[PDB]
Each structure stands twice: as C-alpha cells, then as structure tokens.
Design a protein around this nucleic acid. Sequence first.
DNA 1: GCGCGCTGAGGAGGTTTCTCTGTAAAGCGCA
DNA 2: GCGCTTTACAGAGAAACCTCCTCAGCGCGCT
Length: 254
Amino acid sequence: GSDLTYAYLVGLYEGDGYFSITKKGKYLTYELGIELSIKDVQLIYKIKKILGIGIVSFRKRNEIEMVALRIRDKNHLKSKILPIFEKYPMFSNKQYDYLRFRNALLSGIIYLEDLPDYTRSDEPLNSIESIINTSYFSAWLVGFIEAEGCFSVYKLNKDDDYLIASFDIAQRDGDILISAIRKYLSFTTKVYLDKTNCSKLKVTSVRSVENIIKFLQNAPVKLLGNKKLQYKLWLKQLRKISRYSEKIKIPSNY
DNA sequence: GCGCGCTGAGGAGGTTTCTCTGTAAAGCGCA
DNA sequence: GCGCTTTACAGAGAAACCTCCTCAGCGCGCT
Ligand SMILES: [Ca+2]
Ligand SMILES: [Ca+2]
C-alpha cells in the first residue's frame, strides 16, 4: 500500500518529534512538530516536501541553531497526519499521546476548559513478538534509527591505537521496544536499564556491526538526513579497521 | 461594511533523554 | 597464557521534546 516512506516518517516523529495540545488563552493549539539541530535543515525540508504541509522555522538560543517543522493546521492534521498515524501506528507508549491527540481533535475539543489533565499511560501495549512481526517495522526502524540511533568509532584505551565501532540506541520506558530492536537485529549484548529507567542497547562485535549494515542494505527505505552522513562516515572508518573490513562486505554506495 | 468568535503563524521559555564516548574487566582462540 | 575482542556498565550535557503567549485576519452573522 501507500509508500513505506510514511512508515519511516512515523518512526522518525516517534523518535525526534512530538504530538502536542498546548493552551493559548481560552483556546488550544494542536501541533505535530519536529525540532532538529541546524545540521538537519535539509531533512526538515524533505519532510515538508513529502507531507506537503507545515511551517518551517529557525531559531537561535545561546549560540546553537535549530530548525522546526510545525503542523498546527487542524484540517491538514485531520486529512494528512491522522491517516498516516492510523496506517502505521507508533510502537512505544508515545502511542498514547497520539491516541489522545486524535480523540480530542476529531471530537472537536477547542476550549482549554474541555481538555482533561493528561498523563501518558505506561500500560504496555505490545510484546516483542507483536512489534517484530508487524509488516512495516523495518520501514519504521530506519526512521527510528534516524532519530535515536548513534554510529560512533572510538579508542578502546587512550595510550593505544585499537579502535571500537559501535551502534547504539536508547529509550526511556521503552524496554519492550528496545528489546524488540535487539531481537529483530539479533543482537545479544544485554540491555542496560539506567537509574532513570532509560533502556540502553549498545553493540560493538564484528557480527553485530555486520547485522546492522546488512539490515540497512535490506531495508525498504534509507536514512535521508544527517544520520546518513554519520553512517557513511562510520563506514568510511570501518574500511580502515582490520577485524571489521576483513569479515564484512562493506557497501560503497549506500 | 462591521463586529464576534476562533485561527495558524510567529515568537519564544523549560527541562532531560537521548547521543556520544568511553573504561575496567572478562572472554576466546590457538604452530 | 598472552594478545586480540567483547562485555557490563555508565557519565556528560545538548539536541531534543513539549510548552504557552501575542497578533493580523479568517468566515460568519446580520448586510
Ligand atoms: Ca525521543
Ligand atoms: Ca535525533
């Protein structure tokens, strides 16, 4: 059906974007937005070119620059956004934000006084299996990696030249989801639950690095923005490292 | 030809969860 | 039985997330 770039998009908003109902006087603002580092300006404009709606804005705070796509137009939200987020639903508890967003929108809530206090539910709404078997998962995951994933290379010591390549990704209150990603990519290193309940999956072995590379070659869509640049950089360094390059067919035209 | 209620655009303020980088210790593989 | 590889674990701090306020101008009711 309707292209898997939309699924990518739901993965990306799930990671870096937000569903918001903010108050303005007696009235409400309905917003689907995404604010990124300036180095992702081209991505914001790709999103805008795909969705065909929303307003680009820039802003400087202290000395850092940011870009935002904001979709506040209720009719554009109803006709374009909900259908997307209905065809390819979000996988984590962020799904609860959307559910309440669409409900308040479609049933005409417009007065700050009609809009109940809300607290994101933490009632699990998925198992590893149900996520893993969803047909759009891999499209969604590329969007999610775009938003939340990190590709880095560093020294195992300081007084040495030995290098580590890692892929890593995290979510607060996202044990199931992060575990699902673990399973799907068949990583084996255990998930780190930190003191803030933030689940952290980090990976380094030749086999795991190979699996992520294979996954991104096989995925129905690519990284579009800055995460592409980083992945390409990572690959650049991967070729100069004995143990990875010699056991992996590193692609040259991702 | 003029209010009336309501709006998306525009401008920004607040806080932490992601990113990004490691380290101390432990596997593991083998003429 | 060392040397190349990986793992558990976790800290820093900004690139995110999520928020509210003001204003020019919309369709609309009554022309
Ligand atoms: Ca996020
Ligand atoms: Ca991001």
